[PDB]
Amino acid sequence: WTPFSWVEKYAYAFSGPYNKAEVALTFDDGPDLEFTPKILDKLKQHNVKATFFLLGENAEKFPNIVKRIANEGHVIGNHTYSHPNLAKVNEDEYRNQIIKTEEILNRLAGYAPKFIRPPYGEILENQLKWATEQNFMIVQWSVDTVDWKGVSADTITNNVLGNSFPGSVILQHSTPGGHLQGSVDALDKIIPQLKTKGARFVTLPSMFQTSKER
Structure with missing residues (x-):
């Protein structure tokens, strides 16, 4: 298990460009009936796009x-x-x-x-x-x-504000039946507080300068 050398050999990364004022919100385990729609609403009202795995x-x-x-x-x-x-x-x-x-x-x-x-x-x-x-x-x-x-x-x-840098890829979840309400509510604070520090929110294909489709 050598995840470090893998970024040099394969299409594989943990974070993005250090010289762009950009970070990426990502959400795992969707879709679901409760959290995914709520997340979409909050992303909408903050004018940001995210990536959904x-x-x-x-x-x-x-x-x-x-x-x-x-x-x-x-x-x-x-x-x-x-x-x-x-x-x-x-x-x-x-x-x-x-x-x-x-x-x-x-x-x-x-x-x-x-x-x-x-x-x-x-x-x-x-x-x-x-x-x-x-x-x-x-x-x-x-x-x-x-x-x-x-x-x-x-x-x-x-946590997010203390550990986020240019190029940061943030991990959140929208798992069915998960205990994730605070995670949804966190967006109301995370997004404007990062924007204040000059951060802009992007999608992964944007961050890694490639297409969204294979």
Whole structure:
């Protein structure tokens, strides 16, 4: 496990350009019935676009919300189908997880997502090698809100503001049944407080200067 050398060899990154006043909000495990729509509303009222790493199985349950994300100028990423620990699966299962999810999202969003994020951040080198060869890009994160723990909006905000830099990729969740209300509320503080420091919010394809589609 050498994640550092992997950024030099594969399409793989934790954060973005240090010389741009830009950060990226990302949200994992969507879509869902409660948190995803709330997040969309708050992103809308702050005039920011974000990136959504959607689970294939959740996209099947709520297909229209996937359509809403795309219709509101946000970028969709591939978060596998059923959220398994990729470090424990064989190549066939890994490729199946990605491709099945890609087909689902392509049908709903109108394009095949270029961006992948592995569940728990677990990825193997051969998996990363295949993704690179298939014209994917894998992006982890550099600021973890640990919002799944049910921590408050103030805790998340102080965390994000204390650890965010130019190029920072922030991790939040919109998992069905998750304890994430404070994470949603955190956006009302995180966004303007970062903007005050000169930060602008961008999508991943913008941050990494590539297409959103494969």
